[PDB]
Amino acid sequence: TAEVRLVDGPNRCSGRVEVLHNDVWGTVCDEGWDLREARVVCRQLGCGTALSSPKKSKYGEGKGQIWLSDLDCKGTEGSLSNCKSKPWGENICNHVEDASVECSGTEIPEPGPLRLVGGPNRCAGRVEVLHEEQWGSVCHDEWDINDAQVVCKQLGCGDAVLAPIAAKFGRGTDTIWLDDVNCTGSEASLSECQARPWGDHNCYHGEDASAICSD
Amino acid sequence: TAEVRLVDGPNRCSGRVEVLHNDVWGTVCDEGWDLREARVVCRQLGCGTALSSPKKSKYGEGKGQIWLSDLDCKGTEGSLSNCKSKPWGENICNHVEDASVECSGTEIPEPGPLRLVGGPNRCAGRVEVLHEEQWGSVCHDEWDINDAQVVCKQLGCGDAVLAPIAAKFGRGTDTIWLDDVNCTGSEASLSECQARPWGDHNCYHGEDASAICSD
Amino acid sequence: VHWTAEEKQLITGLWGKVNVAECGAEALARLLIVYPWTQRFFASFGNLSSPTAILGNPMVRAHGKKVLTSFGDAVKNLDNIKNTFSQLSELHCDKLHVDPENFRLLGDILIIVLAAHFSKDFTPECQAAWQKLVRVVAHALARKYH
Amino acid sequence: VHWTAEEKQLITGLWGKVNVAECGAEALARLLIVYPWTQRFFASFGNLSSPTAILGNPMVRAHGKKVLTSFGDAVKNLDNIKNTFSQLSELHCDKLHVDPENFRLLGDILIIVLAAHFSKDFTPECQAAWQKLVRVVAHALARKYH
Amino acid sequence: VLSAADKNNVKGIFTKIAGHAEEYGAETLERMFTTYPPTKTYFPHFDLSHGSAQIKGHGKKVVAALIEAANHIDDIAGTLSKLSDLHAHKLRVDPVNFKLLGQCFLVVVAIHHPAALTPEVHASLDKFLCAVGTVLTAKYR
Amino acid sequence: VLSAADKNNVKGIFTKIAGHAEEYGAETLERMFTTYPPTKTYFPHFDLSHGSAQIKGHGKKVVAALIEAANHIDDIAGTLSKLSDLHAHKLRVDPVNFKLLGQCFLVVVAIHHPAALTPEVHASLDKFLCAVGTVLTAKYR
Ligand SMILES: *[C@@H]1O[C@H](CO[C@@H]2O[C@@H](C)[C@@H](O)[C@@H](O)[C@@H]2O)[C@@H](O[C@@H]2O[C@H](CO)[C@@H](O[C@@H]3O[C@H](CO)[C@@H](O)[C@H](O)[C@@H]3O)[C@H](O)[C@H]2NC(C)=O)[C@H](O)[C@H]1NC(C)=O
Ligand SMILES: *[C@@H]1O[C@H](CO[C@@H]2O[C@@H](C)[C@@H](O)[C@@H](O)[C@@H]2O)[C@@H](O[C@@H]2O[C@H](CO)[C@@H](O[C@@H]3O[C@H](CO)[C@@H](O)[C@H](O)[C@@H]3O)[C@H](O)[C@H]2NC(C)=O)[C@H](O)[C@H]1NC(C)=O
Ligand code: HEM
Ligand code: HEM
Ligand code: HEM
Ligand code: HEM
Ligand SMILES: [Ca+2]
Ligand SMILES: [Ca+2]
Ligand SMILES: [Ca+2]
């Protein structure tokens, strides 16, 4: 069991993932890195339930050895070496691609596959969806008050008030899951709406859709 | 069993292949056209043993319908419609690709896997080899007197006097089977010599090799 | 290099109607007159001293026919263009020493020749298809340059 | 698009040593001042009024970092580049209206930037590999332009 | 440099396209927009659908500028000086796009006037169109 | 059009490549032949091997003409008039090949003088090399 730590974060439940092996600390590449590896690291450290798995050196770049790459954790592995990956040291990555993690510490918001980030409270912020163990934003193409309504009622935040575009509460960072969201307005969840296939889009993160509810 | 005629040739036994179907004489596309189809047309006409199967309108282009294309004769068929092929009139060819055939007129054994054509007689001319039921020429890269010796001895023409390059006796027409032919001189046939794989070359017919023997 | 059912139908439909002897000579001739510097590759063809002479030159008529005929080997086998011109790619590199940039020129002359001969069958969609074919054939002849 | 074992090793080798934060920031800045007509695409980046102001512009450095970062997804899948930039290909066409010919300019500048920072580790054979990489990535971004 | 014969060929071919300014102009644009999809980049705000009044209106302007250049063929940089700034300094059309439009215009006149576009006249229009292209890309190179 | 600042940046970078005429010329050609193999088309009779006496000999001539051009930048067309007919009228090097050679030459100076090739000087050499390229392929079209 390798040993892990979080570095260059605001605290010690968020930061750049670093593992220990052969007396040397090294970073972890973000190929195949997602919430399955994230919940393993948060559990080791005693930091909780793995809010997100930021790619591309969110908390700065490490220096020196890059131990692991192409991690394929099932999510329940005791430590990070108990996962299937490329052999120690063998990688074609670069330190810009050092994977990070954000843990809860004690307070417990996952539920469920939908969340609003970057707002004053739960019921305001851009929209993020949970798909294939990665959080991702929603492009504002075709994004109207009906689409934000489905988000508001799924979160129990009452009715929709606005549906801001152009990343009103700030841009996303890694994955853009949905584009061309075509809701009738009375769907249960956002994944029940008519939209493009998961992952397909013609967008960048300057176009992440938001949602404002009451309140 | 439909009638066949040879049009615009020197005589009855050479020219453009034309088949009779729905009382309309139409040409034959030259894709998949080789000596197997050639000797079917030469038996059917009582014209002998099918010296060659000239592709691409050697005897001019027909007009009107193109009935047959992608012929797959075994070589023993009684007529040309008893061969596996695309349906009547169904093809994407134009008349520049009309197949032709050249028969001998009298029953003789097969000419052999090797022939000198375009010169004064049997024992001097352009080297052409028979492979995959198509006659094709030989490129003149690495072509020396040792390579002409194998051609002369196989044909029973005595020793090789010259191995002319740069298409001395005229350019060939369809296929270039050999390039970089490197014989030692004592080989039994030209397919026993070191060469690029059949059909691989960096040549054109202005570069066809030749050979001259006792004659 | 992905073809659509409509692009194949435009390329196939036009090919069965092209007068290859007459468009091939037309296209190759126009290459030698519109871009006169290409005549150096054809100094063995004889009289190229004037646009009239270049048209009537028998070796220009003959070779232009063979060039357009070789696009037929691409038409009749579209999903295999790279391998069809593998041999001709080597030839044009290390025997003829032809800059691949010229492959673009001859194809765009061909599209103008085809457009002149086909009147109101050479739709904007048909030119899009044949410009793609010319563009793929040209990339295929440039593939094996050492 | 066929890669040789030495070409992959040359691209993998460089990618592990590139100071992406700086090379990407300098390549994008060199685009905006070598070819200053590209500044209209980045009007939201603010102060683009001098070469010194463009190097020091934090949003030019931020976006330039994310551009050289995106070649990383091509580095880590060399034999799968077309699908990796399917997303961005639609973006630059029908969201940004970028002429695909501009992709050549940024990519050829990246080669000059990489040459500057690796001096004599950037052998001609190493340049040839990364010139092919830049050139394939540019063809991938132009693959879906309606 | 458009010798005396080149001038006669170019002025003669615009005799046959003189009345067909809108017709050939809209076709040249639709041709370019179809065979070279990236050229739609510089017209994002336009209606590029087939037969749009915006393609007809802009296409009429394009070849009308060519007609106005065929008359003053001895001075082309001056007669299109007002458009040189629009294309090279304001819009910045990449020069490889001017050969694409010239290619499509040649297709248009070849379809509608095949007997007039002899290989002589082809060569004269190509030199002329390269002259119009270099005038509109003169603020760089 | 090579503003007064472009002229100083260009002459300021040719002072540190003045002595290395043969060295930088051999490497710029070997890079052009390696990254752009089609450019070998125009030298079929040469030894294109690494370190060949012909590449080192002709390579010196290449940047020596650029050095002669940097001295006389008020008039580049006149200082390279001899080579204009060689490349445009006797060899007919297709113009896209000069963009490639200028690209490789920029790579060489970035390797040996990264401090000097600040992006201001980068934009000036690209202005300069694009003018040398135009001179060598301007009598056409
Ligand atoms: C947002 O999504 C709606 C709903 O889409 C409809 O329902 C889904 C469950 C699927 O079955 C879809 O295929 C289906 O279209 C889209 O609204 C629908 O748009 C169509 C086309 O504009 C409307 O068709 C009209 O119908 C009547 C006859 O009923 C005719 O008068 C018209 O000629 C026309 O064909 C359809 O009625 C409409 N449905 C609803 C419930 O509004 C909507 O287009 C989509 N948004 C976008 C931008 O695509
Ligand atoms: C044409 O082919 C000949 C003969 O090639 C030989 O026999 C064939 C049947 C094949 O089995 C070939 O693989 C085989 O080599 C080529 O001549 C041969 O060249 C090689 C390398 O140039 C010679 O090797 C030399 O051998 C001696 C030891 O005997 C050493 O002193 C040298 O260092 C060197 O390795 C080989 O002896 C030679 N063989 C003959 C019979 O001459 C020939 O190169 C080839 N032509 C071309 C243009 O490729
Ligand atoms: C799409 C573009 C081209 C195609 C498909 C093509 C195809 C061919 C073919 C099939 C041949 C062999 C003809 C034969 O067997 O007799 C040939 C030969 C030749 N090619 Fe091309 N070619 C193209 C472009 C060019 C260009 C642009 C040039 C020069 C500017 C060129 C120069 C030559 C020459 C000189 C020959 C020798 C002809 C002879 O000596 O008979 N080719 N080409
Ligand atoms: C190899 C060439 C290129 C690559 C790999 C590339 C890649 C990208 C990527 C990954 C993004 C999204 C960045 C993000 O998510 O924040 C982006 C956006 C963008 N690209 Fe490119 N691009 C290339 C060429 C160009 C060129 C040549 C231009 C302009 C001349 C351009 C203009 C833009 C602009 C304006 C944006 C949006 C920036 C913003 O508003 O934040 N790109 N590109
Ligand atoms: C080759 C000869 C060309 C000529 C004679 C020409 C002429 C013109 C004319 C007369 C106008 C309208 C001027 C005005 O409204 O004030 C115009 C506008 C324009 N041209 Fe061209 N043009 C040419 C090539 C091109 C090419 C190749 C492109 C793009 C690939 C292009 C892109 C544009 C654009 C984007 C506009 C402005 C659109 C608008 O006003 O809404 N031009 N040009
Ligand atoms: C861009 C700036 C260039 C300059 C300043 C330049 C300069 C020169 C010089 C000095 C010579 C030799 C003159 C002599 O030997 O008397 C030459 C010849 C030649 N150049 Fe270049 N050149 C340039 C670009 C190119 C390019 C890009 C190519 C090909 C891709 C090219 C192809 C040739 C050839 C084939 C020769 C003749 C070879 C020989 O003399 O045996 N040139 N040029
Ligand atoms: Ca994983
Ligand atoms: Ca969309
Ligand atoms: Ca057969």
Ligand SMILES: [Ca+2]
């Ligand atoms: Ca050979």
